[PDB]
Structures are given as C-alpha cells and as structure tokens.
Design a protein around this ligand. Structure first.
Ligand SMILES: Nc1ncnc2c1ncn2[C@@H]1O[C@H](CSCC[C@H](N)C(=O)O)[C@@H](O)[C@H]1O
Lengths: 32, 125, 121, 29, 72, 189, 126, 202, 144
RNA sequence: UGUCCUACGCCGGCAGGCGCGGGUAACCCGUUGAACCCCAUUCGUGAUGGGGAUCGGGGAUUGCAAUUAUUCCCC
C-alpha cells in the first residue's frame, strides 16, 4: 500500500476499535 | 468475535468491522441508504444485491471512511463491505461458501476485492 | 455656498475635531493620524500671506511641494504655487475644493496624441 | 521579402516614415 | 424569429391545454412551451395545476427535468 | 436479473448487424446497474470494445470544456433520456440505443492525401470499432448542437436524437452527417 | 392562471416604461437608481407578494411602492443601503432614481470641471 | 481544422453553416476590412462607377462594400445556402450560381475589374475523381482573362496552407497571360498577414 | 429502539426542525432580518422570507453532530465561492453577526449553552427535542 | 503553514474593531467543516435574473504619505 495511505489506515482502524471498547471527579483526597 | 478489514480508493480509506448480528450496515453512523450522492446509490448496494439479502443476515457491518472525495468514498465503501464479508465467511464459515462468494464477486466487477492501483502523478523539476 | 449643508462662515468657525464628520473617510483618517511639521509651517505661510496682502486683491503666490495636504476650509482665497515636477502651477482655492488634495490640480503628465502600397507594374 | 520592415528587437512588424505601412511585393514570372 | 410567448393563459389556449395536453403521451414543461407558445415559468406552473387535479401521472421529479404522462 | 438503473433489462436487446456483435457490448455479461464504473478501459488496444455501450454514451457527453469532469451529471441525463424514450416509443430504451449505433455508423470513409498542392481523396472502408466510435460521437454532438440555445432540455434533445436515428429518419444530425460522408466516399472511389 | 381583466402590459413609472410581463421584483429594476438588491427590500417593506407579475398589481399597491422608494428613510431602509449618501451641497441621505440620477451625475461632473481637478479634466478630455 | 479539410464547398457551407457565418462578429469585421484593401488595390479611377465581378461572393459582405462605394457588381458562388443568405440581406447586385472551375459565363471584355475575397484556395483540392486542380485553376484564369477588359485589374485574396499552393496557383495564373505580382500586407506578422494576388492585363 | 438524527434524511430533518421552531414562536428574530445578505459573497438576499428559522434549525443540527463550534467555525461551514469579478474565484466565509444572532436566539430557546472548552454545544433538553422530531420524520416518510 | 497561524466571547449589515487563550509545532490552527459536485426553489431563449467592464456617492484597514482611485466593503 505505501507509507502515506497505511499511516491513515492504521490510525483509523485503531480508532474504530476504541469506540467498540467504549461501549467523574479526580480523587483529590488519598486517604479515605 | 469479529473481523477488521480495509478497502481503499485514491485517498479515501475505509475500515470495516463485521461480527454476528441481524443484518444492519452503517457507514459513519448512518445507514447505507442515506449516503449523500444518491445517484451512485447502486454502487453502495451492489455487494448486497449481487449476493442477496439473506447472505448478509448473519452479520452486522460498521464502516468508517476518511479522506478522498464524494465518489472516491463510495468506491472504497463498496470495496470494504464486500471484503469484510469474504473475510468473515473464510474464518467462521466453511471455505466452500467463501469460494463461491469470491467467485461471483470477481466476475461482476474486479474492484470489489482487488483495489485500483491508480494514484495522482507527482511533478518534478 | 453650502458644504454638506454647512455654509462657509460657520465652517470657518468650526474647529478640527467636528470637521471629522464633514469630510470623507479618507480625510477623516488623515486628520486623526495628524499633520506633520511640513504642513503646519505651510499653513502659517498662507496665513501670513493673507495677513499682509491688500484687502482688495488676491494675496501673493506661495510656492510649495506639498501635493499630499488636504485643503482645510480656512485656505480659501489663497494663491498656492503647486509643483508637478517641472513647473509651479498657480491655483486659486475656490470654496468648492475642500475635500480634495493639492496634488491633483497640477497634472504631472501630458496627454498623448497619436499611405498604403498600390502596385504600378 | 519584407526584410526592411522587420523589427530587430522584437518579433513583429515596425513602420517606417519614408516608405508606406509594411508590405512586400514579389513579381511573377 | 423572436419569441413572444405569453406569460399568462388567455381564454383560447387555456381550453386548448385542458382538453389536449393530457393526451400527448409525453408532457413536459419544455415540450408544452414549444407548441403552446408560453413561457416556461407558466409551462411548469400549469402542470402542477393538472397534477393536483389528477389529470396526469408523474414519472420523475428533479430540479433539472420533470417528466409527465397520460393517465390511460 | 441485473437491470440498468433498476428498471431496464438487457436480456431482450437483439443486435441486427453481424459486423457489430463484438463491439456493441450490452448482453448478459456486460449488464451493469449503472453507467459509472471508473474502469481502465483505455490502457490497452481494443480494451474499450468490452466497455458497456451506455458507459461509452455517458463518457461522450462529458464534452466541451465546461462539462469536462462532470460524470454524475451525464449519468443523470442518460437516466432521464431512457425514461423519455420509453414514453415516446414504448419499448426498451436499450433497444432504441443499439439501433441508433448501427444506423449512425459510416460504412465507408475518405482520406486526404496530397503530394504538392493537389490534395485529393481516396475512399477507404471503416473498421467495425470506428463504426461505433463515429456513431456515439455523432449522436452526442447531435444532441449537444440540437439545443444549446433553446428551452429544450438536453435530456429530451438526446431522446429525440436517439429515437430519430433508430427510425433511420433524415431528421437526425447523425444520419445527415453520415450520408454526406457516404456521398463524398462514393464520389471518390 | 389567466390574465386579469385589468392587467397592464406596460406600466408608466417615473417617466419610464415598466414591462408588465416581467416579475415585480425585477421589472422595477428597469427604472434607474434601483437594482436587484434595492427593489427586493422595497417590496419587502411594502409587504407585496413577490410571486406576482408587475402586470396584475392594481392602482393601490403600485403607488405605495413609489412612496417607499422615493422616500426610503421613514420605512427603516437603513442609511448604508442608499446610493446617494452625504451630498457635497446639502449633506443628507437619499436615493435618486429617474432623472435625479442623471442630474446628480451631471452635477458631479461639472463640479470637478469647474474646479479643474485631475479627475474632472480626464473626464472632459476622455 | 481549416474549412477546406471538411469537403466540397457545396456540402460544407450547408444551411446550418450559412446561419452562423452571418452572425459571426469576426467575419463581419475582417471580410469587409479585406474588401476595403482589395478594392483599393486595383487602381481604378475615382468618381467613376465601374462594373465588377464578385467571384465567390457567398453571403455578399464584399458585395455590399462595393454597392456602398457606388459601384455595381455581379456575384458568382457555388453553394445555394450562402446565396440564400445573400438574398435575405437585401443586397443590390445580381447573383449567379456556378463553379468558377468550370468557367465564367460572360462575353469577352465585360468587367472593369474582378474582386476575390477568400475563395481561390478551394480549387487547390479536388474532392471528386473527375476534378483536377491544375485544369480547374487554368479554366478559371483563362476564362477570367477573356472576360476581363484589357488594361483592367483583378485582385485576389486567398488563404494558402503551405508554400506549394502559392506556387501552384501562381503558375496557373501566369500561364493564362496575366501579369502582376503578389502583395503581402505585413509580410512577417501573423494575424494581419494577408495575401493579395494583384493581376492585370498589360 | 428509538431513531436518532443520523438515521433520517438531513434535508427532511431541517424542514421539520424549522417548521417546529416557527410554530413555537419563542425564537428571537432580529429586526434586520428582511434587509441583509447573510454572506459577503452573495449577490442577493434569501429567497425565503422565513430564512431565519431554517438557519436556526441547521445550526442546532450541526451542533448535534460535532459540538464545541463557535461563531468562527459556523461561518466556515456556511461559506461558499466568491466570484471576484473578472478575477479568479476564492472561498469566503459567511457573515458573523447572522451566525452569532442565531446562537443567541437558540440560547433563548434553552436549547444551546456554552462549552467550557470552547464554543457552544447542545442542552440535554436540546437533544431530547431533536431526537423526538426525528421520530415524526421517519414515521411520515419511511412508514408511508 | 507559522511565532505569526489562529481558536473563543462581545459589537456592527459588511469590510472591520475590543478582550482573553493555544501552538517552534505528527502537541494549536485542524476530525485542515475547500470549490466544483449532490438535492430542492425562482428564471424561460429575452444582450435576459447571462456578462461584468467603465463610472457616481459613502464607509473601513495598512502605512511618515493613498492625488493618477494601495487594498477591502455597501448601494
Ligand atoms: N469552386 C468554387 N467556385 C465558386 N465559388 C466557390 C468555390 N469554392 C468555394 N466557393 C465559395 O467561396 C465562398 C467562401 S465564403 C467567402 C465569401 C465572402 N468572402 C463572404 O464572406 O461573404 C463560399 O461561399 C463558397 O461558396
């Protein structure tokens, strides 16, 4: 395929996987 | 379990994700019949009409496209939909079904599985 | 005479900061940007020439190179010798030249001003 | 064949003052 | 020569439309205006009238071309 | 059945000319849904003979500069042209089209040669591929110069061009231009 | 529809002929001083349906078009939208249409000639 | 490309080419511009109406320029479509239909001059087996030399495609007894380079 | 099981959404609505007299798709081709005040609020409104 | 592409103003929301709602300075 097209394919194929796995306030205190 | 493929045109790259389902096809979150150039609607529906509505009933495909243009994306969408099914029928259905899908899908139009190796030519001094 | 519905006599009473709206957009920007020392000195020289002149003829001619200085309403009646690069043009400032510059009354260029064979043998 | 009307510094045709506007006459045989 | 197509229906040609145009085998804004000598603005405005009155079947609707047909 | 535009069938199209069977490509293997395919039909000699006949029609209406590139507009036109051809005549618009290519092909042409001044003509015969290359060109320039400045839409100028050519009428631009090419060739044996 | 019984083929507005076949938004543009842009907002302020031709407008609504386009400022036509802004002589905002456009243009020519400006001299010589 | 590549003049200048020739802004300009130079090129005396020949008249643009300058003329052309457009323009002179390769059908010693604006080069090509360029050029100039009165002049504007057509026209012209030369206006320009055969009988 | 915005025709959705906003009567329509071009590259004013509602409807629909859009982002959406006389054409943005006054008008409808990391987004009540109207879009079109 | 690219908020109808941030950069502009293209509306063969030159009046910006129109916008 080549360097430029494959870079966009791999980046796009990764981002479709993440929105399958996807389907608060930070802990300011450390001792409960 | 699922299968993750790609199909391409000049710069319009597609990725398709197919798994068990009831037969819904989505592109960028939209159905296959709402993709914007309605003149080339049959190019989106060729792998569905060639194979039949029953053959796609055991799979749900979700396609993402980025880059290219209005008709370059349609040629990449129809490639990765058909290429996703021939990969899914290979790994989880017997090869006899995969051979007969790959047979009738090449004799119609060779660009549904093997990509077009045409890209813009650069200019040199 | 009226200029923008304002006669000459209270236009002479009128100061600079309320002359802003009576001029056009170009002259309004120029007056905000200020007037340099070159045109302050010239305005005094027209004021001096109008001072000592006899009150029944036009004043003496003032020669200058300032082609880019707009004509304020107090300049009317003056004798300005404006230079086109070759000679000084003597222009008498009528009250109808208020919004205009001085360079366009001394034109720096001249107009341009621009038998077939018949065989015998 | 019209060589006296040819402009040296530019491709085209330049007029002369003694002679008429540019032309070329060649007789027959 | 120059076209002096009418911009509104007179009494003679309005009857000529309502008894002849729904039997042509093709009805189009452009083919009506060539024979009835009317402007194309009314040539399409007369056909949406006939469509609402049910005298004509619609074949295609498009921003560039509109195609109409007889009933039977 | 694979139908053109979803409503035109390629089964019933019968080509009457023996010479043009290999080159008018609309039959069961070349039946496609749309005249858009983006196929590489000009990378090799006689590759375009296998191109479907309607795609060659749409590629030839992309002409005269301002329309160079716009193919989605030309497939729009041939879609509307076939729906008018069915209306006026009543049979398959593909059958009307393949009769037009047959009747608009010059069977004999002339070439221009000249050694010194004397430019004369000799009549030569026309290959079966150029009988199609000339026929599509004459129908497309027939419909283009038909309207260009009147209220007639190109969709119904192209329908009125293909219908007249299939009838063999002299009202066609293609038939009138074909016959004068035949008339010059007869005079220049 | 049909021609009304009181349809006008030619309308006499501001001593020019206004064609009645043309649509009202663009038949008004035949008079000078109004264009495709001024005549659209004038017909919007008059509350006149723009689908009508210029021929079937009756004597009522054709006269309130005139008193709008001759007198625009009391119908909220904004000050920037007028062609004749602050005059040289009497600085006020107006919209000159039929002969006022030609007279103001002529007056702007002879003003530049009398003062012998460069712009007025090159108009004279050219 | 060039109009002569299309075919015979009777078929190329058909009904549809005749219309767009009339409404052709470049054609209306330059056809009369060359006819002004070509009428001036034959040195005929002023204040004297003459009788001229308009060979290859076509639409009659060059014919109308003579009539507006006080002359009278007759036009000879081969295609009926350009002759029909000449009638519709309400021209003054007479019109004749015929091929100048077959001869000009007039009595000897008739015309005070002959005018030609872009018609001559249609004889250097023969699109019939019966036609020969050499004999059709000679049958033109021999009949022209008969019909033209002695001492008169014929000025011919023509559009050659190479150097050989200029030669092949000239030798046929000088073999019928004509004397003169070639007048080239702006001989080293491109748009204004016009060729003029000035021919006169002694 | 409920239909969403993406599952229907976007052209039919704007016609339904603008028809909804007009019937509510709570949009704040500015006074210069009948006298302005809504882009510097236009030759004329909009043909439709109620152009503000369809612009308002198309603003909400575009904010649903990609949130965080400001005034500068929406002038870039609605820009087009400026034919610069005899010079070659270029791309020019829309008019900023029309884009701004729409976003103020949607805020008065309690449909749009500002975003802490940028421009504007949709209200949780806003997205409840648009997804309901997509129900009537598909019911009258896909079920007929 | 860049320390000159710009995001966002407010004002004006537009050119354009005021404020506050990101980015020496596969980090911000920028998911570079480009134009033809696609779908609806009006126009209807008319030098016409094609074509825009040449002009008149006004407004805004950069500059020591805009006159012989720096440039941009409106009628
Ligand atoms: N062999 C021939 N004999 C006579 N006329 C001929 C000819 N070949 C061509 N012509 C004529 O030459 C004409 C050229 S058209 C030019 C005519 C004229 N200059 C005008 O513009 O009005 C055509 O009308 C054609 O009819």
């Amino acid at each position: 395929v080549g360097p430029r097209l494959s870079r966009r394919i791999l980046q796009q194929a990764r981002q479709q996987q993440e929105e399958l796995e996807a389907e608060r306030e930070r802990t300011t205190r450390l001792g409960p | 379990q699922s299968v993750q493929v790609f199909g391409r045109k000049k710069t319009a790259t597609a990725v398709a994700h197919c798994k068990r389902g009831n037969g819904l096809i989505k592109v960028n979150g939209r159905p296959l019949e709402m993709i914007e150039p309605r003149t080339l609607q049959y190019k989106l529906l060729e792998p569905v009409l060639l194979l039949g509505k029953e053959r796609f009933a055991g799979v749900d495909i979700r396609v993402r496209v980025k880059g290219g243009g209005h008709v370059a994306q349609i040629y990449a969408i129809r490639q990765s939909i058909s290429k996703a099914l021939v990969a899914y029928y290979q790994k989880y259905v017997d090869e006899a079904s995969k051979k007969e899908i790959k047979d009738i899908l090449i004799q119609y139009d060779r660009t549904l599985l093997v990509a077009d190796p045409r890209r813009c030519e650069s200019k040199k001094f | 005479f009226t200029y923008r519905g304002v006669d000459l006599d209270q236009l002479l009473d009128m100061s600079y900061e309320q002359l802003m709206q009576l001029y056009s957009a170009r002259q309004r920007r120029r007056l905000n940007r200020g007037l340099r020392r070159k045109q302050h000195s010239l305005l005094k020289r027209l004021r001096k020439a109008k001072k000592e002149a006899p009150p029944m003829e036009k004043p003496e001619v003032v020669k200058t190179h300032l082609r880019d200085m707009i004509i304020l309403p107090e300049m009317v009646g003056s004798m300005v010798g404006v230079y086109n690069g070759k000679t000084f043009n003597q222009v008498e400032i009528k009250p109808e030249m208020i919004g205009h510059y001085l360079g366009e009354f001394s034109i720096t260029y001249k107009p341009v001003k621009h038998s077939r064979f018949i065989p015998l043998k | 064949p019209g060589a006296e009307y040819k402009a040296k510094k530019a491709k085209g045709d330049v007029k002369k003052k003694g002679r008429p506007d540019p032309y070329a006459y060649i007789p027959l045989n | 020569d120059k076209l002096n197509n009418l911009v509104l229906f007179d009494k003679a040609t309005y009857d000529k439309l309502c008894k002849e145009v729904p039997n042509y085998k093709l009805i189009t804004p452009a083919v009506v205006s060539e024979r009835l000598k009317i402007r194309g603005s009314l040539a399409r405005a007369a056909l949406q009238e006939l469509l609402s009155k049910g005298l004509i079947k619609l074949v295609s609707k498009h921003r560039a071309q509109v195609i109409y047909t007889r009933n039977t | 059945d694979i139908k053109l535009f979803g409503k035109w069938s390629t089964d019933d199209v019968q080509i009457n000319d023996i010479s043009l069977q290999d080159y008018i490509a609309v039959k069961e293997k070349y039946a496609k849904y749309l005249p858009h395919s983006a196929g590489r039909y000009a990378a090799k000699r006689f590759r375009k003979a296998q191109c479907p006949i309607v795609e060659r029609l749409t590629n030839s209406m992309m002409m005269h500069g301002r329309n160079n590139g716009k193919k989605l507009m030309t497939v729009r036109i041939v879609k509307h042209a076939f729906e008018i051809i069915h209306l006026l005549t009543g049979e398959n618009p593909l059958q009307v089209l393949v009769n037009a290519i047959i009747n608009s092909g010059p069977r004999e042409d002339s070439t221009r040669i000249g050694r010194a001044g004397t430019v004369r003509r000799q009549a030569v015969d026309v290959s079966p591929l150029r009988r199609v290359n000339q026929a599509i060109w004459l129908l497309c320039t027939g419909a283009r110069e038909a309207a260009f400045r009147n209220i007639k839409t190109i969709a119904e100028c192209l329908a009125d061009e293909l219908i007249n050519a299939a009838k063999g009428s002299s009202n066609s631009y293609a038939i009138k231009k074909k016959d004068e090419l035949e008339r010059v060739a007869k005079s220049n044996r | 529809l049909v021609i009304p019984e009181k349809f006008q083929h030619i309308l006499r507005v501001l001593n020019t002929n206004i064609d009645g076949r043309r649509k009202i938004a663009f038949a008004i543009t035949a008079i000078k001083g109004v264009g495709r842009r001024y005549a659209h907002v004038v017909l919007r302020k008059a509350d006149i349906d723009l689908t009508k031709r210029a021929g079937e407008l009756t004597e009522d609504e054709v006269e309130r078009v005139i008193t709008i386009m001759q007198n625009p400022r009391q119908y909220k036509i904004p000050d920037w939208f007028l062609n004749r802004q602050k005059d040289v002589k009497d600085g006020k905002y107006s919209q000159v249409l039929a002969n006022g456009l030609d007279n103001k243009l002529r007056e702007d020519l002879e003003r530049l000639k009398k003062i012998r400006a460069h712009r007025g001299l090159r108009h004279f010589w050219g | 490309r060039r109009p002569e590549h299309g075919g015979p003049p009777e078929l190329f200048y058909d009904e549809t080419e005749a219309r767009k020739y009339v409404r052709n802004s470049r054609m209306i300009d330059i056809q009369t511009r060359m006819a002004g130079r070509a009428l001036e090129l034959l040195y005929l005396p002023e204040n004297k109406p003459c009788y001229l020949l308009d060979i290859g008249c076509g639409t009659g643009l060059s014919g109308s320029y003579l009539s507006d300058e006080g002359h009278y003329w007759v036009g000879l052309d081969i295609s009926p479509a350009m002759l029909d457009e000449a009638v519709d323009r309400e021209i003054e002179g007479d019109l004749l239909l015929g091929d100048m390769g077959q001869g000009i059908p007039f009595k000897p010693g008739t015309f005070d001059g002959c005018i030609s604006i872009s018609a001559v080069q249609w004889l250097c090509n023969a699109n019939k087996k019966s036609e020969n360029p050499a004999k059709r050029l000679y049958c033109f100039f021999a009949s022209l030399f008969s019909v033209l009165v002695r001492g008169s002049r014929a000025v011919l504007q023509l559009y050659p495609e190479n150097s050989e057509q200029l030669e092949l026209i000239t030798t046929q012209a000088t073999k019928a007894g004509f004397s003169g030369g070639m007048v080239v206006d702006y001989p080293n320009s491109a748009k204004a380079k016009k060729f003029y055969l000035c021919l006169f009988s002694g | 099981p409920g239909v969403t915005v993406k599952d229907v025709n976007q052209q039919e959705f704007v016609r339904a959404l603008a028809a909804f906003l007009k019937k509510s009567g709570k949009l704040k329509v500015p006074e210069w609505v009948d006298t302005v071009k809504l882009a510097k590259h236009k030759e004329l004013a909009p043909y439709d007299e109620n152009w503000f509602y369809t612009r308002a409807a198309s603003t909400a629909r575009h904010l649903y798709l990609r949130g965080g859009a400001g005034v500068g982002s929406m002038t870039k959406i609605y820009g087009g081709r400026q034919r610069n006389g005899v010079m070659p054409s270029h791309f020019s943005r829309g008019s900023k005040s029309v884009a701004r006054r729409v976003l103020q008008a949607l805020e008065g409808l309690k449909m749009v609020e500002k975003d802490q990391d940028g421009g504007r987004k949709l209200t949780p009540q806003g997205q409840r409104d648009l997804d309901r109207i997509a129900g009537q879009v598909a019911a009258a079109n896909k079920k007929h």
